Amino acid sequence: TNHNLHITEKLEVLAKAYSVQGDKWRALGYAKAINALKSFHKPVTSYQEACSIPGIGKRMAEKIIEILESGHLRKLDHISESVPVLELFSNIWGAGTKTAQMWYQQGFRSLEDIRSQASLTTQQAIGLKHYSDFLERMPREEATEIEQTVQKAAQAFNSGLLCVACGSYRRGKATCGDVDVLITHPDGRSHRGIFSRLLDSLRQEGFLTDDLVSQEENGQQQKYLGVCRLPGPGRRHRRLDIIVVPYSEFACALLYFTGSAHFNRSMRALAKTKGMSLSEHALSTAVVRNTHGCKVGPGRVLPTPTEKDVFRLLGLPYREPAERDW
DNA sequence: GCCG
DNA sequence: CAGTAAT
DNA sequence: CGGCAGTACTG
Ligand code: NA
Ligand code: NA
Secondary structure, eight states: OOTTHHHHHHHHHHHHHHHHTTOHHHHHHHHHHHHHHHHOSSOOOSHHHHHHSTTOOHHHHHHHHHHHHHSSOHHHHTOOTTHHHHHHHHTSTTOOHHHHHHHHHTTOOSHHHHHHHSOOOHHHHHHHHTTTGGGOOEEHHHHHHHHHHHHHHHHHHOTTOEEEEOHHHHTTOSEESEEEEEEEOTTSSTTSSHHHHHHHHHHHTTOEEEEEEOOOSSTTOOEEEEEEOOSSTTOOOEEEEEEEOOGGGHHHHHHHHHOOHHHHHHHHHHHHHTTOEEOSSOEEESOEEOTTSOEEEOOEEEOOSSHHHHHHHTTOOOOOGGGOOO
């Protein structure tokens, strides 16, 4: 339970404003502080108490107190009038802050402006077509039906294929923004050439309705991001994201694709403090980095049969997927 | 924005 | 490459 | 000061 809703609600506004205007790192700082506040055991009632909490510094503390005393936040009143419009545009799949700001500068103010006048990438046109659907979450039960549709199609041409739904699904969420399907084969080799077979099968049953990201030219495709819809009435278009990985990469892929994103970043951050590196492919040791924290030497891949291995190798207690929201 |  | 995306 | 995660498409 959030014991500081009146605080975080207002900070969240300012946070999203920074995010759509492209101030990525300031927005990150806000997101951490906000999460810290959602998690504190009590109402925060003083400046000194606010500073005591990890993720909250003096600058955030001052804003917390201002809200606590005056019920308003001055910084809110002076947010650029463009921000609601920037948020509107940035919620088009395939458009980010740079495109949203360009569209705004060009005079566009509504999705109707975008449809009739804006230059749209192929992805952004699909995003616009499914604008509402892409902002909806589906019941986790529908995610199950989607995973089963992909699994049945995959296993139909290779029974050995393992398919698992990840992301918010695997973390136990009641609703899911998309379906993340990880596919591998416990024999190191068979997982090659399968995107082409899988996709053509899912198209032939009319399941896939649009492709957003799908490099099908050379058989080195690693991901599919697209759109599907189950049969029958009352069905919405749902985002479907599929990755196919070598078996030896299964645990790191499972871990990455399960998330959350913040959980991933925090775990990878920790790995870097230990001169290690964690990606969707592997956990590596003895990685060489320069003074800016940038990789200049590859390191060594560590064997990680299971998720518990990754945790173990990082000196971390295991955390079940449901406990990985942050 | 936070923090080492 | 810059932009956007995946978690 | 300056890092804030590590990856994969698009065009
Ligand atoms: Na977007
Ligand atoms: Na997801």
